[PDB]
Write a protein that binds this ligand. Sequence first.
Ligand code: NVG
Ligand code: BR
Ligand code: BR
Ligand code: BR
Ligand code: BR
Length: 269
Amino acid sequence: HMIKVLSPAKINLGLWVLGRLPSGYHEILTLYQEIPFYDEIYIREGVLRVETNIGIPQEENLVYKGLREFERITGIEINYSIFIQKNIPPGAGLGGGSSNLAVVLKKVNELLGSPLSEEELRELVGSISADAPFFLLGKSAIGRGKGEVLEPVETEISGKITLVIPQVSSSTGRVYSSLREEHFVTPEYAEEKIQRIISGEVEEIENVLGDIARELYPEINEVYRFVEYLGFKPFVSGSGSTVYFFGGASEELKKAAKMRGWKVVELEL
Ligand SMILES: Nc1ccn([C@@H]2O[C@@H](CNC(=O)CCc3nc4ccccc4[nH]3)[C@@H](O)[C@H]2O)c(=O)n1
Ligand SMILES: [Br-]
Ligand SMILES: [Br-]
Ligand SMILES: [Br-]
Ligand SMILES: [Br-]
């Protein structure tokens, strides 16, 4: 009785770090934007299995971690075989794995007569990834706390957006660990910035994790400089590796990408 479910990506339309938390993590402000860029997930009745087309081990897969915890918390034994076709590359700053977790666990929860509430499902996915709760709502949302405290918004942002994803995988943890005092801002500064971006002022997007990712992973910086050379303002999603801009992909970019192993994703917001 196989079904297909789409698992969308996100971009951060700006990100600010407020400071450190005792738990090791960081308090942040960010604007999440769901983008029409998907993994396709095939769900089938059978022995609990989570597989991908890119060789992520089952034990390490956030979806498998989430389904085991589902069983654990709720008592019910999960009998679904999951295959995910991964169009959203891991380490790309697009929340692919967090999206996989949210959409699968929301589906499996519904398929089993909704044992968990939307409050409890939120807690389940949120405990594994701070970006996962966003994918339970999608569209546009302000992310506060560690990103899980969410406020839906309407933006004035539409039109072409192009992603340029280099083959380097950015470690979110390594980027956050390179943070210094100088990188932090007040929540007031960041809140003013987010308001402006929401009103369509894309020029106001900035992201200190992108600044750092460009130093830690020089290829992210190469993509960044190439987009400038193309005549666009580049922006970085999450902790990288993705660089995006508000414009179309020229043949020259497509050529550069094919030669260098960049993925170019042309979307419309
Ligand atoms: N609001 C947040 C959200 C996340 N984080 C950091 O990134 C989180 C994600 N990291 C991990 O799950 C383990 C480290 C890691 N992340 C990777 C991403 C890609 C490739 C390898 C990685 N190793 C936490 O480690 C935390 O230090 C944080 O400090 N503050
Ligand atoms: Br520090
Ligand atoms: Br690199
Ligand atoms: Br440079
Ligand atoms: Br940026």
